[PDB]
Design a protein around this ligand. Structure first.
Ligand SMILES: NC(=O)C1=CN([C@@H]2O[C@H](COP(=O)(O)OP(=O)(O)OC[C@H]3O[C@@H](n4cnc5c(N)ncnc54)[C@H](O)[C@@H]3O)[C@@H](O)[C@H]2O)C=CC1
Ligand SMILES: Cc1cc2nc3c(=O)[nH]c(=O)nc-3n(C[C@H](O)[C@H](O)[C@H](O)COP(=O)(O)O)c2cc1C
Ligand code: SF4
Ligand code: SF4
Ligand code: SF4
Ligand code: FES
Ligand code: FES
Ligand SMILES: [K+]
Lengths: 44, 263, 213, 430
């Protein structure tokens, strides 16, 4: 059934304060190992 | 050698790759005006006083930051170079306070001198100026932040040479203030050298404050004895009384700094 | 409005601040997004996290971000005073942000600003005495075709009239939650008198794909 | 082709612009996205660079630098440092609200664009610097990226091509200057959003010191459609060196302010009178149009009649194309008050770094605040012009240029209105 009348983006009515950061915490496992500069910080 | 040939006002000079426009003009004896560039600090590129015309290029370049490319003819005295210098000096003197008589930097100010040299001789600014809250960063450096031209030699010195990382810019825009953001006492062992490299009277010497004035001081080039480094100093005196102690440049000792004990 | 700090009894380095353990796991997930040796790149997210746990930023959240990321505290003070979202003063529970730049001012955002002012009894920059509403005036919020619009803490409220914004303030006072969308007839950004484009069905996978691919 | 406009729905890149279809993965794959992505990855970097150079795609951020030439700056072997794509998603420009629509309604198209763009430049990951005020848009995009990782489309072994590519989203914190590419890099690096000087360009020293291409949401998201449909398809629309489709944001004093995708060289009058429902009060009620968001100078009604909405025909109309954000201003507009509110925006959104913008944008806002009331004299007009000419090209980034240009457009087209403002101030106050 083709519909061009209803706004399908109703999910952002259900976003809380920590939604972005919990999505980041969920995506923390799918990611490649970060590159390293060879030192702990530019002050090390 | 891998030296490339550039031109300053037509005159050729051979430079190492990585040489800036400012250093290339230095090699033929011309000093491009500057406020934030310091040869012992990192390149900031944020006072825009070194804007200079490269010919066959319709834009002024930051001479402190732009490296020379092979074949550039640097026009240090052309029309749009001088228009850029006068415009930038006009913006520096927009919000700068009329404090030159009550200022310890009068007569030894970069802003006065290269306003006489490279800026206009009058104001188009018809508004009211800003006034910045002063800070208390110790018993040595008198702070009058209304005079600050926001050149960030504070920050580059306290980060790179002093190793303190406690001066920085808060705010944004015209409300951007150089300070510690808290009531913090900037007392390093090299904390008085920010009195030197500040081109304006925003950071002055609190012991030296109000006592002398640079043209009447005799300069005696002498040696530090407060430690065994042997820092070269200038004892500046006035009528048989020692007024203050400045550093001399010596590339192998103290490059152009002295400690707070010396100062 | 200042960009220096003075130690009040409610804002000092002896003000208690600590993250929750779920916030520490969120911070570790943030730090793992950046290369090793560039942990300072997590200054802006984690400090924003310190605004989401607390509502604002005392000078103990800035020092805690400076402590857990191994950065100097002035480098966090700079970020916390540079960016306009970091509340360095305790704002209300609903932080109303009215956009009054030129595309919203052309469509009469001042009517909605005055409607919020006379509705809540405060002016621009102040907080209602029940600590529920802070009204400030912000720049372009990126909802220009839905002008005029406000923002309440996360949520854009668009195509507004003074009646609509009085309704939104009434249901913020009522303890409910409003719907973050355009309060006119349209849905997101379309022409209000019907769809002038994208009326045909979308062509699906494989449409117009060039050969050799 | 001579005439332009009236773009069909089969030729749209941003289908589901309006949020009317499903933005998620089953909705995006059913509209053409993530189709034959493995072959686009496996045909190499130079093929994708040749497709983007063929398409004539210019930088949708607003400057219009050639996207193929821009992305080919990364086409060089590594030196130990990783390489990065960074997608600019701040969009703080007044008038401009299209990248919000791409992130919010076609998010997987932006993810596939990150994959294709980062493959073309050999990049390791993507950093989508989204604006922090677009919080629901950011969580929208993160749900999409979670769908893309769980479907094996990005990450380890992206689309089964043996190429590894992460997609990171970093929120902003409320600074318009962080949309500028080096200031965005500095904001990603956990510092103040202050622009770096160029050189070094980000292709040499970008984010974290790495080779980095910062590119807009629209110039990144159209790249899978260019790689699927072809370069000749995208070069078939618009004039020469003005190729493609473009999202337009017609706001202000129109009957129906809207975002609409349209062919590139469409006339401004046709665009406003077709998609926006015309100016409120008719076309004779038109006073001025800011054609591409606040950074471009306004043009009056005598210029808006025959002007084409691409780059070169707006350069010839002594303005810029910019972000193609059309702000329409009718005859009832206090136009000096609008330009002064705009210069007030430019002083509140100015990072304070170099001297001409930090001092002169506040000094221009004080002059414009006196020009609204008329509390001045006409010799200060040309003075103000020269102040703009002391900011234009004398700054680190182009926010000084983007603040000098509206003042120049207002003076150049409405000097008599300024003068009669000030002389009626002089007669009713002196
Ligand atoms: N989309 C938005 O929200 C906004 C857009 N703008 C637009 O942005 C433009 C000004 O922005 P800028 O990026 O400062 O201007 P533009 O001169 O510098 O640069 C555009 C791109 O071209 C690249 N580029 C140009 N010459 C290059 C070279 N020789 N080598 C390597 N890369 C080179 C730069 O890296 C950059 O990514 C204006 O057209 C303005 O309308 C301005 C404000 C907001
Ligand atoms: C002050 C200033 C703000 C900018 N803001 C944005 C922005 O918010 N979004 C954007 O895509 N480009 C912005 N740009 C343009 C960028 O510098 C850059 O050209 C663009 O982000 C990526 O290049 P592209 O045009 O090839 O896509 C801004 C430029 C300036 C000078
Ligand atoms: S710092 Fe220089 S220009 Fe400023 S008041 Fe002192 S002497 Fe005058
Ligand atoms: S106080 Fe002096 S050295 Fe420090 S930023 Fe200001 S002008 Fe520069
Ligand atoms: S011109 Fe303005 S926006 Fe750009 S680096 Fe300078 S202060 Fe920042
Ligand atoms: S000296 Fe080059 S900009 Fe300050
Ligand atoms: S002008 Fe108010 S949202 Fe852009
Ligand atoms: K000094």
């Amino acid at each position: 059934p083709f519909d061009n009348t209803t706004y399908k983006n109703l999910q952002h009515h259900d976003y809380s304060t920590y939604t972005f950061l919990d999505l980041n915490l969920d995506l923390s496992k799918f990611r490649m190992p970060q590159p390293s500069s060879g030192r702990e910080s530019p002050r090390h | 050698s891998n030296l490339i040939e550039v031109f300053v006002d037509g005159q050729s000079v051979m430079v190492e790759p990585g040489t800036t426009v400012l250093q290339a003009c230095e090699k033929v004896g011309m000093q491009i005006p500057r406020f934030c560039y310091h040869e012992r600090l990192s390149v900031a590129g944020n006072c825009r006083m070194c804007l200079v015309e490269i010919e066959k290029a319709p834009k002024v370049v930051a001479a402190c930051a732009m490296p020379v490319m092979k074949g550039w003819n640097i026009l240090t005295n052309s029309e749009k170079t001088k228009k850029a210098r006068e415009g930038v000096m006009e913006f520096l003197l927009a919000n700068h306070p009329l404090d030159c008589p009550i200022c310890d930097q009068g007569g030894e100010c970069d802003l006065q001198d290269q306003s006489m040299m490279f800026g206009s001789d009058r104001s188009r600014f018809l508004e009211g100026k800003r006034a910045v809250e002063d800070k208390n960063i110790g018993p040595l450096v008198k702070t009058i932040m209304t005079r600050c031209i926001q050149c960030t030699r504070c920050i580059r010195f306290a980060s790179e040479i002093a190793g303190v990382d406690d001066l920085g810019t808060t705010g944004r825009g015209n409300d951007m203030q150089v300070g510690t953001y808290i009531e913090k006492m900037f007392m390093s062992e090299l904390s008085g050298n920010i009195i030197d490299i500040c081109p304006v009277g925003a950071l002055t010497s609190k012991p030296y404050a109000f006592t002398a004035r640079p043209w009447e001081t005799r300069k005696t080039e002498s040696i530090d004895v407060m430690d065994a480094v042997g820092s070269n100093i200038v004892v500046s005196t006035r009528t048989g009384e020692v007024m203050r102690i400045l550093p001399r440049m010596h590339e192998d000792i103290n490059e152009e700094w002295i400690s707070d004990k010396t100062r | 409005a200042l960009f220096v700090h003075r130690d009040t009894p409610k804002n000092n380095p002896e003000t208690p601040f600590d993250f929750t353990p779920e916030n520490y796991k969120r911070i570790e997930a943030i730090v793992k997004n950046y290369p090793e040796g560039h942990k300072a790149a997590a200054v802006l997210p984690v400090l924003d996290l310190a605004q989401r746990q607390n509502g604002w930023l005392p000078i103990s959240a800035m020092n805690k971000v400076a402590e857990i990321l191994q950065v100097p505290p002035m480098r966090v003070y700079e970020v916390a005073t540079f960016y306009t979202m970091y509340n360095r003063k305790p704002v209300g529970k609903y932080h109303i942000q009215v956009c009054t730049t030129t595309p919203c001012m052309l469509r009469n955002s001042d009517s909605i600003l005055e409607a919020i002012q006379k509705k809540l009894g405060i002016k621009v920059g102040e907080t209602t005495p029940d600590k529920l509403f802070t009204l400030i005036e912000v720049e372009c919020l990126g909802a220009c075709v839905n002008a005029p619009m406000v923002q309440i803490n996360d949520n854009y409220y668009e195509d507004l009239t003074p009646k609509d914004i009085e309704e939104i303030i009434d249901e913020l006072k009522a303890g409910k939650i409003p719907k973050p969308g355009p309060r006119s007839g349209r849905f997101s950004c379309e022409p209000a008198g019907g769809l002038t484009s994208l009326t045909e069905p979308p062509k699906g996978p494989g449409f117009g794909v060039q050969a050799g691919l | 082709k001579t005439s332009f406009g009236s773009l069909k729905d089969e030729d749209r890149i941003f289908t589901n612009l309006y949020g009317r279809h499903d933005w998620r993965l089953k909705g995006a794959q059913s509209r053409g996205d993530w189709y034959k992505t493995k072959e686009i990855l496996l045909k190499g970097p130079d093929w994708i660079l040749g497709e983007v150079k063929t398409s004539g795609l210019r930088g949708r951020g607003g400057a219009g630098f050639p996207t193929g030439l821009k992305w080919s700056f990364m086409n060089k072997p590594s030196d130990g440092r990783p390489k990065y794509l960074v997608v600019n998603a701040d969009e703080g420009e007044p008038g401009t609200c299209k990248d919000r629509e791409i992130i919010r309604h076609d998010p997987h198209k932006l993810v596939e664009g990150c994959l294709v763009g980062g493959r073309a430049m050999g990049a390791r990951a993507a950093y989508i610097y989204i604006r922090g005020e677009f919080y629901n848009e950011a969580s929208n995009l993160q749900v999409a990226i979670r769908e893309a990782y769980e479907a094996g489309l990005i990450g380890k072994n992206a689309c089964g091509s043996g190429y590894d590519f992460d997609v990171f989203v970093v929120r902003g914190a409320g600074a318009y200057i962080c949309g500028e590419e080096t200031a965005l890099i500095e904001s990603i690096e956990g510092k103040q959003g202050k622009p770096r000087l160029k050189p070094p360009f980000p292709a040499d020293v970008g984010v974290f010191g790495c080779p980095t291409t910062v590119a807009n949401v629209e110039t990144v998201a159209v790249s899978p459609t260019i790689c699927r449909r072809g370069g000749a398809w995208f070069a078939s629309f618009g004039r020469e060196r003005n190729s493609g489709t473009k999202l337009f944001n017609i706001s202000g004093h129109v009957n129906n302010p809207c975002t609409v995708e349209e062919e590139m060289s469409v006339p401004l009058k046709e665009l406003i009178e077709k998609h926006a429902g015309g100016v409120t009060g008719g076309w004779d009620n038109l006073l001025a149009v800011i054609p591409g968001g606040s950074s471009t100078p306004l043009i009056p009604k005598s210029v808006c009649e025959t002007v084409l909405m691409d780059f070169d025909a707006l350069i010839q109309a002594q303005t810029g194309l910019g972000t193609a954000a059309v702000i329409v201003m009718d005859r009832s507009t206090d136009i000096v008050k609008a330009i002064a509110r705009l210069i007030e925006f430019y002083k509140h959104e100015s990072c304070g770094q170099c001297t001409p913008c930090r001092e002169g944008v506040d000094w221009m806002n004080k002059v414009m605040a006196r020009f609204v009331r008329g509390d001045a004299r006409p010799a200060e007009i040309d003075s103000l012009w020269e102040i703009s000419k002391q900011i234009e090209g004398h700054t680190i980034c182009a926010l000084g240029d983007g603040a000098a240009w509206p003042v120049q457009g207002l003076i150049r087209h409405f000097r008599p209105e300024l003068e009669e403002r000030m002389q009626r101030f002089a007669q009713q106050h002196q």
